[PDB]
Amino acid sequence: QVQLVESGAEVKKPGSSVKVSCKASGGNFNMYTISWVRQAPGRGLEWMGRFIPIANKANYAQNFPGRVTITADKSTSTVYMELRSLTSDDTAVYYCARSGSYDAFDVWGQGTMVTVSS
Amino acid sequence: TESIVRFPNITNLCPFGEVFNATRFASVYAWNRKRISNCVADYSVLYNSASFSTFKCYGVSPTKLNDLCFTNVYADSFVIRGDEVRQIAPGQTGNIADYNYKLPDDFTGCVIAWNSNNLDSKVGGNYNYLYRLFRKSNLKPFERDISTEIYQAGSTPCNGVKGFNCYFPLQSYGFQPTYGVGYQPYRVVVLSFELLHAPATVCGPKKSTNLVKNKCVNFNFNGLTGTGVLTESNKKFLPFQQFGR
Amino acid sequence: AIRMTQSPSTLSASVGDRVTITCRASQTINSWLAWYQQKPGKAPKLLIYDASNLESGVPSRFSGSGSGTEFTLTISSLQPDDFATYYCQQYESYSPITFGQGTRLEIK
Ligand SMILES: *[C@@H]1O[C@H](CO)[C@@H](O)[C@H](O)[C@H]1NC(C)=O
């Protein structure tokens, strides 16, 4: 039973940066990729980036050029997603999803509510 | 004077449409193996069905497959990059032929592969396909080793933690549609006919004819070709015996 | 970037009826497409993967079909527990993965 636990809620100011976590518990961390999905209130889901443990690579969405930098500590099976230049439109719950087995996000984290305001 | 191709009577169609048309092909280190039996296999239909970049058949001509009955047919399927397709053959060496999938030197069967760049390559990179890269000893013929334990390449023990002189045995391919032609995924399907003919259960279509006794006929009994006069005999055949010799 | 379009965006039906949701792609994504369900206040859970399979633990009433550019999710016997927002993934290009616009199912 793989369980993903994220960090607590974060409150930031516009122009700052945030960095959330996703602790992968159970299973093999070296094979399944962790994908970060955000959801602004009143809007549908949106994909942010992917961390590929097997290739030790990180991918980012085309709509976010250089805004997202994803790293992880394979020793503790913890994935960190860094979002830069926060604005008023980035107030969204940042889920972390494990695209396991069949490339689909079978296991989703609890999600952290990141609020960006003055 | 006449031929009598008296094959066993069966009408089931072999599920070649479930091994060549699977949505996902297993990773090369965990290649799926399917045992096909109790069906009529029309190898000509699958031969002229798609664009098979490699249809090397070892030990039997591709056209003669419809005229033979096989004891067991195994369809080992996986995904391999273009440059390593040549390693799926007897007497080959490399990471694929030693660490992932080893074909025996006495291999008897076809090896089928086609460039599937429209199904196993994604823009960001398809990492679902992993090939083993470090192993203690080369694989024996037809052996699947799906252990992901860290390989100790140094004197210091790794204790399940990857680091200096400690590497993860499996390394992804990461296919992309803009990769090289020799770096695209080839969905390989290796058929391994178990040529024994005694409990022959997989056969070609080969419509049968009526048995003719007491006359020189070119019999084709269950794949056992030859020529002779088939005379009914009082041989005490056991229930599990097919041919006497 | 592959753009996904859902229809209808907002839908209403009663308990026990038949519901059809169409999520049409812009490019041929073969059969790589997954259907989610996001009850408000919870993380979305996977229902369909490869556009036709059924995720383990999902009630059998959920069925998906279609390939190429038009896909379809259908519920044989709608239930009160099955009222949420359903998204469709397009995991055929990982740059970027595009969800659907969201299909909210409401009690009629
Ligand atoms: C796979 O499906 C295609 C399309 O239906 C068909 O043309 C082809 O013959 C199938 N392959 C086999 C081995 O049946």
Numbering used by the authors:
A (entry chain H): 1 to 118
B (entry chain A): 320 to 564
C (entry chain L): 1 to 108
Q: Which sentences from the paper describe this structure?
A:
S is the major surface glycoprotein on the SARS-CoV-2 virion and is involved in viral attachment to target cells via the interaction of cell-surface-expressed angiotensin-converting enzyme 2 (ACE2) with the receptor binding site, at the tip of the receptor binding domain (RBD), in the S1 fragment of S (Lan et al., 2020). Following attachment, cleavage of S releases S1, allowing a major conformational change in S2, exposing a hydrophobic loop that executes fusion of viral and host cell membranes, releasing the viral genome to initiate viral replication (Walls et al., 2017). In-depth structure-and-function analyses of 27 potent RBD-binding mAbs isolated from vaccinated volunteers following breakthrough Omicron-BA.1 infection reveals that they are focused in two main clusters within the RBD, with potent right-shoulder antibodies showing increased prevalence. In summary, we have presented a structure-function analysis of potent human antibodies induced by Omicron BA.1 breakthrough infection in SARS-CoV-2 vaccinated individuals.
The second, right shoulder, cluster was seen in the full set of early pandemic antibodies, above the S309 site. As expected, these antibodies (structures obtained for Omi-31 and -38) attack the RBD from the front and sit above the binding site of Vir-S309. The locally refined Omi-38 map is also shown, corresponding to the region boxed in the global map.
